[PDB]
Each structure stands twice: as structure tokens, then as C-alpha cells.
Amino acid sequence: AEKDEL
Amino acid sequence: MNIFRLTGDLSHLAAIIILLLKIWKSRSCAGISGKSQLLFALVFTTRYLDLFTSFISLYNTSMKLIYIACSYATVYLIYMKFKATYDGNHDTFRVEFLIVPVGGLSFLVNHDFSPLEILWTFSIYLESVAILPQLFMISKTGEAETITTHYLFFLGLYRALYLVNWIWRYYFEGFFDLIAVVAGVVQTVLYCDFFYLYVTKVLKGKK
Numbered sequence: 001a002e003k004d005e006l
Numbered sequence: 007m008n009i010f011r012l013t014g015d016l017s018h019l020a021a022i023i024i025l026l027l028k029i030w031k032s033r034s035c036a037g038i039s040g041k042s043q044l045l046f047a048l049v050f051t052t053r054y055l056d057l058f059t060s061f062i063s064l065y066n067t068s069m070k071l072i073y074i075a076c077s078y079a080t081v082y083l084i085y086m087k088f089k090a091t092y093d094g095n096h097d098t099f100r101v102e103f104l105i106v107p108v109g110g111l112s113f114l115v116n117h118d119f120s121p122l123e124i125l126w127t128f129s130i131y132l133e134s135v136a137i138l139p140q141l142f143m144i145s146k147t148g149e150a151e152t153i154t155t156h157y158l159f160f161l162g163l164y165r166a167l168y169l170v171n172w173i174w175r176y177y178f179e180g181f182f183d184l185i186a187v188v189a190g191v192v193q194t195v196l197y198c199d200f201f202y203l204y205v206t207k208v209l210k211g212k213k
């Protein structure tokens with residue numbers, strides 16, 4: 001699952 | 007993106023700039039834990055390795071590059087440029103008690119046993135305890151300068167806003183990441199005494 005946060 | 011994560015990110019960038027400009031203008035890193043800055047630089051280095059595998063947005067790429075640059079520049083100012091004012095004698099937290107167990111835990115408790123995911127997990131657990139050397143230095147030495155407390159306030163508020171962001175995303179998108187959440191709760195709980203003292207003393211012109 002691609003990380004969309006920092 | 008939602009307003010809680012955006013404010014959270016802006017609060018984090020604020021803290022990073024407050025500290026960097028404070029050391030730069032004063033030409034001194036007195037009262038600052040170099041150890042905490044090394045841990046934050048290690049967090050961004052292990053978390054943002056995806057910069058080579060993924061593109062989320064221009065904002066996401068730029069923020070990652072800005073965080074890495076500012077964290078490495080802060081480390082440079084403390085350990086190289088303004089090394090004469092680095093209080094090594096009071097920045098004595100043994101960071102091996104954080105790195106070695108967090109390292110062990112990231113390999114053992116993760117969403118996937120793959121190098122990039124393990125390193126991302128390490129960044130999440132390490133960030134939860136990364137400020138401990140700074141809070142430890144403050145407790146050892148005499149208090150904290152006002153600009154240093156503002157840095158700690160915006161840094162602590164950032165991950166607290168991420169918790170609100172996760173409630174929002176769970177409700178509206180059905181998305182949840184228990185590793186990020188638990189570690190985020192740990193990250194925020196460690197600021198409890200600082201928050202109480204910042205509101206009751208610092209915001210009232212005391213300490």
C-alpha cells in the first residue's frame with residue numbers, strides 16, 4: 001500500500 | 007488530503023524552520039540536543055526512500071525534499087558550523103537504547119517483511135521517541151529558552167493533528183494504519199507534561 005502521508 | 011493533515015504538515019514545517027532560523031541567526035546551538043536532530047534526520051532518510059518508487063504529488067515530493075534538506079542542515083549547524091556552542095556535556099541521552107530496540111521491533115512487527123516497508127516501520131517507531139534526547143536535556147539543564155519552547159509546541163502539535171487526520175480518514179475513507187496510529191499516540195503522550203507547562207507557564211510569561 002502506497003504511502004500518501006508524510 | 008484534509009485540513010487536519012495539512013495543518014499538521016504546516017505545523018511540522020513551522021517547527022523545523024523555527025529551530026533552523028534560531029540556530030542560524032544567533033550563531034549558536036546552546037540548549038539544543040544534537041542527538042534528537044540526528045534521530046529526526048534518520049527518520050526522514052528511512053521514511054522517504056519511496057521518493058525513488060512513488061510519485062504522490064508535487065506537494066508530497068517537495069515536502070519530503072524540504073524535510074530532508076532542513077534536517078540535514080540542522081545537523082550540519084550543530085555538529086560542524088556552530089560546534090563551539092554545542093553542549094555535548096548536557097546532551098547525554100544514550101540513543102542506543104532507542105535505535106537498537108526500535109530496529110528490532112521494525113523487523114518483527116510490520117505490515118510486510120520487505121526492505122522498504124521494514125525501513126518505513128523503523129521511521130514510524132523512531133519518530134515516536136526522537137524528541138526524548140531534547141526533553142531529557144531540558145530536564146537536566148536549566149529550563150528552556152522561549153523560542154525553543156515554540157519549536158517544541160509546533161512539533162508536538164503536528165503529530166497530534168495527524169491523530170485527528172486518522173479519525174477523519176477512518177470515518178470518510180475506511181482507511182486505518184494501526185502501526186502509524188499506536189506510534190502516533192506514543193509520540194503525542196510524550197509531550198503531555200511539556201504541553202501542560204507551555205500553556206500554564208510559557209503562554210502566561212512564566213518559566
Ligand SMILES: CCCCCCCC/C=C/CCCCCCCC(=O)OC[C@H](O)CO
Pocket residue numbers: 135138141142145192196197199200
Ligand atoms: C513515559 C515516560 C517518559 C516520559 C518522558 C517525557 C516527559 C519529559 C521528561 C523527559 C526526561 C527524560 C527522562 C528519561 C526517561 C526515559 C524514557 C524512556 O525510555 O521511555 C521509553 C518510551 O518512550 C515510553 O513510552
Ligand SMILES: CCCCCCCC/C=C\CCCCCCCC(=O)OC[C@H](O)CO
Pocket residue numbers: 013016017020024153156159
Ligand atoms: C519565533 C517563533 C515564531 C512562532 C510562530 C510560528 C508561526 C506559526 C506557524 C504555523 C501555523 C501552524 C498551524 C497551527 C496554528 C496554531 C496557532 C497557535 O496556537 O499559536 C499560538 C502558539 O502557541 C505560538 O505561541
Ligand SMILES: CCCCCCCC/C=C\CCCCCCCC(=O)OC[C@H](O)CO
Pocket residue numbers: 016019020023024027
Ligand atoms: C524567526 C522566524 C520563525 C517563523 C517561521 C515560520 C515558518 C512558516 C512555516 C511554514 C511555511 C508554509 C506556509 C503556511 C504557514 C503560515 C504560517 C503563518 O501565517 O505565519 C505567519 C507568522 O509566522 C505568524 O506568527
Ligand SMILES: CCCCCCCC/C=C\CCCCCCCC(=O)OC[C@H](O)CO
Pocket residue numbers: 107111114115116117118
Ligand atoms: C520494545 C518495546 C516493547 C513493544 C512490545 C509490543 C509490540 C507489539 C505491539 C502491539 C500488540 C499488537 C499486535 C502486534 C502484531 C503482533 C505480531 C504479528 O501479528 O505478526 C505477524 C506479522 O506479519 C509480523 O510483522
Ligand SMILES: CCCCCCCC/C=C\CCCCCCCC(=O)OC[C@H](O)CO
Pocket residue numbers: 103104107108115116117131134135184185188189192
Ligand atoms: C529505555 C528505552 C526503551 C525502549 C523504547 C522503545 C520505543 C518504541 C516506541 C513505540 C513503538 C510502539 C508501536 C507498537 C507497535 C504497534 C503494533 C500494531 O498494532 O500492529 C498491528 C500490525 O498491523 C501488525 O503487523
Ligand SMILES: CCCCCCCC/C=C\CCCCCCCC(=O)OC[C@H](O)CO
Pocket residue numbers: 009010013162163166167169170194201205
Ligand atoms: C484545523 C486544526 C487547527 C488546530 C489549532 C489548534 C490550536 C491549539 C493551540 C493551543 C492549545 C494547546 C493545546 C495542547 C496541544 C494539542 C495536543 C493535545 O494535547 O491534544 C490533542 C489531542 O491529542 C488530539 O487527539
Ligand SMILES: CCCCCCCC/C=C\CCCCCCCC(=O)OC[C@H](O)CO
Pocket residue numbers: 169172173176182183187191194195198
Ligand atoms: C476491525 C479493526 C478496526 C480498527 C479500527 C481502527 C481505527 C483507527 C482510527 C483512528 C484512531 C485515532 C486514535 C485517536 C486517539 C485519541 C486520543 C488522543 O488524543 O490520544 C493522544 C493523547 O493521549 C492525548 O493526551
